Ligand binder design. Structure first.
Ligand SMILES: [Zn+2]
Ligand SMILES: [Zn+2]
Lengths: 243, 179, 259, 246, 179, 258, 245, 258
RNA sequence: CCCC
RNA sequence: CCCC
RNA sequence: CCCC
């Protein structure tokens, strides 16, 4: 609280462009089409994907393509002061935005009059959950085998005591002077488009163009961990058959 | 390592011919799904680490009879045998009397009852169905009177509770709870 | 609705084996699945437990914080059980406030805990008149493969049992462990006709939503029971399933020693 | 709060196996298809049955059988300290289990794509109202002539001072050791099976089994009053038939 | 005492024949409702203390017309003369042009109208309706244009507000408020 | 719209009757149905009453308890009037939260009480601007055969007139009767065309939901009125109905001579 | 705080006489997106009304085979009152909306548009006494501007009661310490009051006083109506001036 | 669907003109339409302001009152920012709040105010740790011709500037002009292909709800942004559009201070 | 609550 | 409200 | 929350 950066390493020791400890696991849920458990530092997340399923009772169905729903729920025990079960404004909000990501990327034209439904719970919440949730949901999507154009990978670029930082932690959010969640389409091993972009703090024109750059580093880093996980899953379906 | 993530570049279009699992955009082919990229006769496909089944001519299929018009049973095709994942192209298909059985049948209601669950092969497009094979048939029926599940006895179906009796096109696997 | 079709058939198969005195996985009729009980899954939370019962898995977390007592009952702490059977814990869950099944699930877990006097509500008092502790037990289904209820009563009592009161930081003293004095356990059975299946699985439920739940304390007292579903319960059957259940409850309790 | 039983008697003077005073009147409402007013101790409940009636949303019907809905609800003035109108956890629940009691027994097969609606309101509530509502509802259904395998009858057993007592009173729920509501299906003037069964408390496996015994004996007494309620209703419609002729 | 309550044993299923108000089970017969047990000719039935009417052939019925075709008129049936209780078997009965006035008619338009209220006699199940009778027919019709309740005028109907006159198969009870 | 084929017919009959200048039961056009006012029907309530208005039934229960006054008015204390038209009476009663009717009904009853100043609020004050009696009037319909409104109004006042304050219970002194200084009564007529029908049957109600409701005090002062339904009211006819209603209210008021 | 006095020297706390309306303004067709609109100030009240239809109706189980259905939502923005109010429906608004609908139900020629919905939204930007009357006046303008066939116009005023005298179009202080509040709304056909469409009341009033207020009201109604006619004339000129561009 | 049909043809048109690097109204790609800011449109309201922006128009009113701060900050007052996209503004818009878009626009707008620190929540401290000035700010859309968002941002910063703290009325001192430091300005641009637009119009919106939004403070820092819709944002565009935005936000801040 |  |  |  007195000062964010001492010596040039943050309060938990990381660099300026050092992600937190990530952990990612596909196919954790029996009764779901795809799933993923993941953690980003202290965040503990799990995404589930159901679909393409018939969409009911009726009428809400789009005739030319598929519809994507995305519910982002924090559990009561996830936060310091027990949250109260139910959609915050923040929730309805994060859900529209997170859902909009995947709308760009999923190949919904392949599945007319149908739903592809995404639900993601936060079991433990820290700075960045919203970003952990997207990564998770992205893995579940691939796990569920919904045809996509590529991958969605997401990181928060923050800023503490005048300097930018990667994957901000709590205190840096609570006493930082920025907080900027990105999420890119990765196609062909590289970062292409922006899928999700949300800034709110004080940042120069030139700080912002920088920050974009700091982000697509964390992204290739995480994307790889995402590949590693969908690969581990690959070996497993392969081992179960080979039996 | 033949493994691919969605977004991986398989190659150029004029070069390779798009197959299952693959999309094009800018003349390049791409992997839409995670899995083992396979290539044969210039055709590039991707075996998905989690395939979404598609129903097609040839397949075996589970369904419920949702509406009996005349000479025509509308079955609600639900599952595609051999894959647990719900298909992408499920919905209504047609069980026309000609196909109900190899013998001759009139008044299709005497083969296939309202709300019957059945087991059928897809013989045409648009989920058109055949019941003719021995395997194919009604898997479960409710008493047309007291709505109790009908027990198979012989070549006919009987209601225990109510003793009534109904004649149907009966899959061998009737009552077995398998299909 | 097309979902119904896969299930009606699975129902026919479960009923086929029953007719031949079998359960589809070879279990005894009085046999639970493999139980795993992992405490401390949720750091920030004061207590927490992940439970696995077969492929069915649930988390419960316990958060506490000071609050105002009930005006009619001072001198007592407060315990508030709630469950969320969220979208993703099942193909058949729709988002929103608790449906009626999300509700009875929590009221049962709460019942066992309360009727057994599992936590010492009195020792949770801070200022006798309007400052007292408030224990939030929140159940959160993750994977539903049959019998979320027993899994939830099991994790609940497990989470409480690894609960640290957050004294300091509220400026109420030092952090201690919560005085748990009992061990509610609940055994649920799928009644079918004149037979019962202890610890039903999602597949077995195809038969129908017709259960019996009996909860006991550490002394084998019956402490909570709940028949549920549209059916007539045979008395002979009830009598006999009374004893099997108390017994099953003894074995699950043994998994709490854990050496 | 001192003792609940002394010299073999409960605070209101009943023995351990004695019912509270019950009044039952059928056919009391003019717009319902069947109804019943019911007093049980200081409980005052009124039940209405509607149907079989059409059912919408067209999706919520059952192609093969009738659906059953049951709303149990406490009037703000029924309790000692005014109660907000509107559902709560306890009501969603009671409504649920109480419905299922009747799902077991109504012959829903006879009325496909239909609803049979049971509404029950407690006007003044003492201990054991779920019990009161169930009994009132049964009478109501019979009065609406909706087909049933038999009668639903309901009594609760409790435990005070380590004694099992039939039909607990308020002081006995509040300061007892057990509260256990039963409901039985009645066929041939005999108890056949359990239709409703909840318990909260601390009982020995022996006490459970003994409790089902006490509940039964009591439930049969209540069932004889339910019958008489309808017996009256029957005498009365025939009496009116004899009046038109006059 | 002939009075019975639901759940009361009536006899063996061998002995008597389930009639209205009785159900069979386990070989026995039981009252389903409360009322008067009657056994006429091996047949046991209970007279409900509150009957639930059921529409059969011969019953005089009332309903609104919900759809017109060319050969047929679809009427949403709702009530059976005699009881105020809604009937169990309520729904869409059918009005065929021939069954209307013992004489030729080109279109049922000539007879019935959309949102008209009818008074029919059941000719067959699935609520096959007739209206040939003087008693039967329309009881309340709205103007095609302007939509006000039309008043009878001898052998024709005309609305007051507008003046337009229409011709329909008129029930002798039209306008009476009775039926 | 299947439950209203039967309705539409009964509407015809009521109408073919009106044309002959006659009601379906022989009543005159200003004649209320029979009336019963039973007090003290709910003992565990502070005040209560059950009114019968023909085959129409409604029961009202009153409950009092300490509370914070209006931020505005630190004097007097509060009366809340709620109404449940639960599915008990009428199939047309759906379950759930208040419909426009349950509301209109409560607000009309509340009005006649509030505006007639029939209960001295300034009386039930405990601590100036701190603690004050809150008076809950809860209206619960039972059997709906038309005019649930008038019945509730009749019952609500009878309820209030038989109310004991819960002082002892609240360590606030001995219990005492609620000071009731007035007697709001309300007369609802079904307007059809240029004719009125006082105190309509549910059957008569088949004609349409088109009514006028007039509510007077002790001294015959009009204290609340309500036109409702989508019809146009002839000022000619309003003028009679006023006179007739203040009258009807008076006759009704001399029922409370128990 | 209360004026305690109200009527003084024959003139009210704002100087109006017993039968003088507050200053009224009435713009027609202000909203571009609606079919018909109307801004309308009435004393300190500022309200806006849009109209949409006849149009198609979902759910459609709510649609009516033989005639149009009408909906009206009366809504008081938060900054419109003195102590900022929770947005959305309270029981007062729900009641007002039921009755306001029913006024136009009497007049709109629903039969011309089976299976349709004419919908009316009225928005209170700034609140003051008798805003339900402002709104009603504003809707009728919006209706007409929207060309929805109607039997005749609808106009409304409230009569109050201060210090024993009947006042016209009551303002806040006389509606809070007065002795009665009584809103009317009339069908105006052929330049003359013809029917009553809306009638509410509350407070102590004598039989003789009720009938007097009715006179007092109509006189106000006819005065308001005239302004409505002029609101529409202005429109008439505009759409003409556009052709004719 | 079925309004979704008329819009589709319009869409063809808008694109056809983008194929020609020109718009439907001949407007330039970095050019807002006619702006207009009217303070004090709602008296009886410590703050107000109405913004027409082309045919779009929105009012915004600030209210204020004593209250308790959140557990965290005992050191400052608070600012809540709600909105309503009433059906007044459009056919589609839902009646009852809060729909999701509602939630969005409010928050974006709240971000810029709270993020610019364009109000001294420290100066609105009644007494520390118990009472502070709570500033409400409700957006009410009147007419929706596109970019109610930008409109609403402007109207909210206009209204807050012209706000008079009701200190006197609440017994806290002499009323004063509200201490407003910064001046946040949001620019929403509509994106399709590699090309950005304006300041989008409803007709242009026919293409799809694919937009970007960047908010700057007086000193030209960026205080908030928001991609929005189902599309992929090319980084090259963003780059240009970051510059083009910052400059559009200054043309407006002059249109602000005259 | 009622009122606006 | 705002954050998580 | 729990009971009523
Ligand atoms: Zn049968
Ligand atoms: Zn006409």
């Amino acid at each position: 609280p007195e000062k964010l950066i001492v010596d040039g390493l943050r309060l938990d020791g990381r660099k300026f462009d050092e992600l937190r400890p990530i952990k990612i696991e596909a196919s954790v849920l029996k009764r779901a089409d795809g799933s993923c458990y993941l953690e980003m530092g202290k965040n503990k997340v799990i995404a589930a994907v159901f679909g393409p399923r018939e969409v009911h009772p009726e009428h809400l169905q789009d005739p030319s393509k598929a519809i994507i729903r995305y519910r982002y729920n924090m559990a009561p025990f996830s936060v310091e002061e027990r949250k109260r079960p139910g959609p915050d404004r923040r929730s309805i909000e994060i859900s529209k935005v997170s859902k909009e990501a995947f709308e760009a990327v999923i190949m919904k034209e392949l599945f007319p009059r149908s739903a592809i439904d995404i639900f993601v719970e936060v079991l433990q919440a820290d700075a960045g959950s919203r970003t952990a949730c997207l990564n998770a949901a992205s893995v579940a999507l691939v796990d569920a085998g919904v045809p996509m154009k590529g991958m969605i990978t997401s990181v928060a670029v923050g800023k503490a005591d005048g300097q930018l930082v990667l994957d901000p932690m709590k205190e840096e959010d609570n006493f930082g002077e920025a907080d900027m969640p990105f999420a890119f389409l990765i196609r062909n091993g590289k970062i292409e488009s922006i899928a999700l972009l949300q800034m709110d703090g004080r940042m120069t024109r030139d700080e912002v163009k920088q920050a974009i750059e700091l982000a697509k580093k964390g992204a290739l880093q995480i994307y790889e961990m995402q590949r590693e996980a969908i690969l581990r899953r690959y070996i497993e379906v392969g081992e179960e058959m080979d039996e | 390592m033949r493994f691919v993530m969605p977004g991986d570049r398989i190659g150029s279009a004029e070069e390779y011919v798009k197959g299952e699992g693959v999309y094009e955009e800018g003349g390049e082919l791409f992997a839409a799904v995670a899995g083992k990229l396979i290539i044969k006769d210039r055709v590039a496909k991707v075996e998905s680490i989690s395939p979404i089944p598609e129903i097609v001519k040839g397949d075996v299929v589970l369904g419920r009879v949702v509406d009996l018009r005349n000479s025509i049973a509308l079955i609600e095709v639900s599952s595609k045998k051999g894959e647990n994942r719900g298909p992408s192209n499920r919905g209504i298909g047609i069980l026309h009397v000609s196909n109900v059985d190899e013998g001759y049948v009139k008044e299709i209601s005497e083969a296939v009852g309202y709300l019957d669950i059945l087991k059928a092969r897809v013989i045409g497009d648009n989920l058109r169905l055949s019941t003719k094979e021995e395997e194919m048939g009604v898997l479960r029926a409710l008493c047309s009177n007291c709505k109790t599940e009908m027990v198979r006895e012989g070549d006919i179906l009987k209601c225990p509770e109510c003793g009534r009796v109904e004649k149907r096109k009966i899959s061998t696997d009737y009552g077995k709870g398998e299909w | 609705m097309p979902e119904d079709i896969l299930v009606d058939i699975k129902r026919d198969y479960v009923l086929s084996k029953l007719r031949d005195n079998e359960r589809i996985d070879g279990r005894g009729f009085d046999e639970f699945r493999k139980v795993e009980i992992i405490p401390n899954v949720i750091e920030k939370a004061e207590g927490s437990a992940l439970v696995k019962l077969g492929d069915t898995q649930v988390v419960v977390g316990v958060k506490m914080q000071p609050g105002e007592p009930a005006p009619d009952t001072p001198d007592r702490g407060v315990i508030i059980v709630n469950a969320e059977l969220v979208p993703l814990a099942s193909p058949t869950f729709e988002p929103g406030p608790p449906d009626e099944n999300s509700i009875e699930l929590a009221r049962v877990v709460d019942r066992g805990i309360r009727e057994s006097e599992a936590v010492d509500l009195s020792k949770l008092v801070i200022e006798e008149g309007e400052k007292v502790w408030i224990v939030f037990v929140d159940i959160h289904a993750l994977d539903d493969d049959g019998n979320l209820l027993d899994a939830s009563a099991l994790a609940a009592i497990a989470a409480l049992m690894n609960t640290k009161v957050p004294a300091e930081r509220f400026d109420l003293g030092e952090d201690y462990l919560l005085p748990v004095r009992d061990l509610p356990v609940s055994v649920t059975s799928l009644i079918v006709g004149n037979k019962y299946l202890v610890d039903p699985s999602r597949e077995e439920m195809s038969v129908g939503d017709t259960t019996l739940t009996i909860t006991t304390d550490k002394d084998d007292n019956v402490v909570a029971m709940q028949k549920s579903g549209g059916y007539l319960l045979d008395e002979k059957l009830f009598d006999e399933l009374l004893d099997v259940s108390i017994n099953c409850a003894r074995k699950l309790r043994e998994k709490f020693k854990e050496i």
